[PDB]
Nucleic acid binder design. Structure first.
Ligand SMILES: [Zn+2]
Lengths: 120, 317, 53
RNA sequence: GGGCCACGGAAACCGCGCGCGGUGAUCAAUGAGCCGCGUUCGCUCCCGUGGCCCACAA
RNA sequence: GAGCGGCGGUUU
């Protein structure tokens, strides 16, 4: 699996990922697409970054994992860019998503930042 | 899958005793990185988007080059093999502009046609075609895959053939019509899709790895010796004692030749090589391979373009 | 973009699995590049790690 | 005289395309639409200026 | 100045 994919993520952990994104969309505030996602990290607005594992070419998202770390922003990988896209409220796909303002997902997000923390 | 560049050549030996003095000249992998650039050619994988001309202006600004020139101009949406000759090697594109090309093309039919009729109708375009009015060869076409109205195929052609227009004529001959929806150049002369095929991201990153991190290895593999741009041409190899004379604008006389390719005819564009296989000059033959071999006096090659600097070899005259 | 290729075989195909070899295929075209290269610094941070410099 | 090498044989505006910044879309988020800023390589002849050589390979 | 592998239009 892709070289930008910097660690193994469990199925239910990657499921919670979609969940937090699902919720945050309508109760809170997200950004969809690698360009908005990257803006949010640079601007220090993103609470969590979600990256799809099937991004081809890799260069599309490969700057993401190292950018987060510079800004100490937590990020997780999900299996599919189609599934991650549907969660974000668009029909088309999404290489990546930023959860700007959580809402009903406050605990879930806070939970995830903890699990991933251990995988680094 | 055969282009005229692919023909195998036979080396005829003229002077069995000729040897090269390892103290003179710089064969490709004895070239310091800076000298390698000065006489380098990039096998660039052009992205879809920018023009060929813009891409090269990027390369010049980011690599701090004074000069660089591409071969066959690929259109903005077309990706693939774009040779970029650098600095003192710039003028070798004139060896590529005329070489055969190959493309993988995606054709979208405007109406339904049976798979067999497509394949059968497309095979009729091998050989000459017209366009502009001018004529042009299709060396081969192969249909990789068909998916309803989408036909993916490879085609080998002569320089200056428009694939877009070829696809349009294929559309007319099927009745239903067609346009080209995707194009990628997979080959141009001696440049092909091998490990030398390098993207812009890689090109610029290797550069920085060299300039800022002190690692020379990647950038050096990113650049090819200008001799590469000349692999498809017939060659004559000359003795050390003729090389500085040639670089000084002398015509190459029969007594200067050590080895040559078979099958050279008068008028042919020839590469003139040292016995180390450095490129000396491009010239035009004034003799056939058999004449150059049998004779002991006379002008064998008219030296037109000289690439090697005048000081790599001593003035042995 | 639709044109794809085998990383193993070099076959061009529209499919996701090579029909000669069976490997997953990849998009034939190179990523888009821009002379600004806003994330170059971070792409190089990733690429060194991959390469081992 | 001849060969070879270098320089030269236009400039400012507009537009498409593309790229970047901003906004971010009822199947283009691997970026719609819009706004602003950027943005287009050389080669071959031939002619002019200047430099190096006149070397059948010893 | 005339061509090869056009970015397109208007002003001296
Ligand atoms: Zn194969």
């Amino acid at each position: 699996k892709p070289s930008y994919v910097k660690f193994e993520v469990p199925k239910e952990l990657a499921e919670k990922a979609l969940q937090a994104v699902e919720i945050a969309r309508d109760t809170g505030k997200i950004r969809k697409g690698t360009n908005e996602t990257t803006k949010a990290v640079e601007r220090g607005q993103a609470k969590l970054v979600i990256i799809a594992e099937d991004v081809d070419p890799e260069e599309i998202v490969a700057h993401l994992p190292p950018l987060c770390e510079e800004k100490e922003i937590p990020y997780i990988y999900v299996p599919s860019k189609k599934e991650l896209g549907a969660a974000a409220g668009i029909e088309v796909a999404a290489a990546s998503v930023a959860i700007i303002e959580p809402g009903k997902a406050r605990d879930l997000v806070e939970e995830i930042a903890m699990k991933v923390k251990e995988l680094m | 899958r055969i282009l005229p560049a692919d023909i195998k050549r036979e080396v005829l030996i003229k002077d069995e005793n000729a040897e090269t003095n390892p103290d003179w000249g710089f064969p490709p992998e004895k070239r310091p990185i800076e000298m390698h650039i000065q006489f380098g050619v990039i096998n660039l994988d052009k992205p879809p988007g920018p023009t060929s001309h813009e891409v090269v202006a990027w390369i010049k600004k980011i690599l701090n080059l004074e000069k660089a020139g591409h071969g066959g101009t690929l259109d903005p949406k077309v990706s693939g093999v774009l040779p970029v000759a650098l600095e003192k090697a710039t003028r070798v594109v004139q060896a590529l502009l005329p070489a055969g090309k190959e493309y993988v093309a995606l054709m979208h039919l405007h109406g339904d046609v049976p798979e067999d009729k497509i394949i059968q109708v497309m095979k009729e375009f091998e050989g000459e075609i017209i366009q502009r009015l001018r004529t042009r060869k299709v060396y081969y076409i192969e249909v990789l895959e068909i998916e309803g109205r989408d036909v993916l195929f490879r085609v080998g052609v002569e320089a200056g053939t428009y694939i877009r227009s070829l696809i349009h004529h294929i559309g007319l001959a099927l009745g239903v019509g067609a346009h080209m929806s995707e194009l990628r150049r997979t080959r141009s002369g001696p440049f092909k899709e091998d490990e030398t095929l390098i993207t812009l991201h890689d090109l610029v990153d290797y550069y920085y790895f060299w300039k800022e991190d002190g690692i020379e290895e990647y950038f050096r593999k990113a650049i090819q010796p200008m001799e590469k741009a000349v692999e498809h041409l017939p060659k004559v190899w000359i003795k050390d004692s003729a090389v500085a004379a040639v670089t000084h604008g002398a015509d190459l006389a029969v007594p200067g030749i050590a080895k040559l390719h078979a099958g050279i005819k008068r008028g042919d564009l020839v590469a003139i090589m040292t016995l180390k296989d450095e490129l000396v000059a491009l010239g035009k033959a004034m003799m056939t391979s058999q004449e150059m071999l049998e004779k002991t006096k006379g002008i064998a090659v008219d030296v037109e373009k000289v690439f090697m600097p005048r000081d790599w070899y001593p003035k042995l005259w | 973009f639709r044109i794809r290729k085998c990383p193993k075989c070099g076959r061009y195909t529209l499919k996701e699995v090579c029909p000669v070899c069976g490997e997953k295929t990849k998009v034939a075209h190179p990523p888009r590049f821009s002379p600004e290269d806003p994330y170059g610094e971070y792409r190089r941070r990733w690429k060194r790690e991959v390469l081992g410099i």
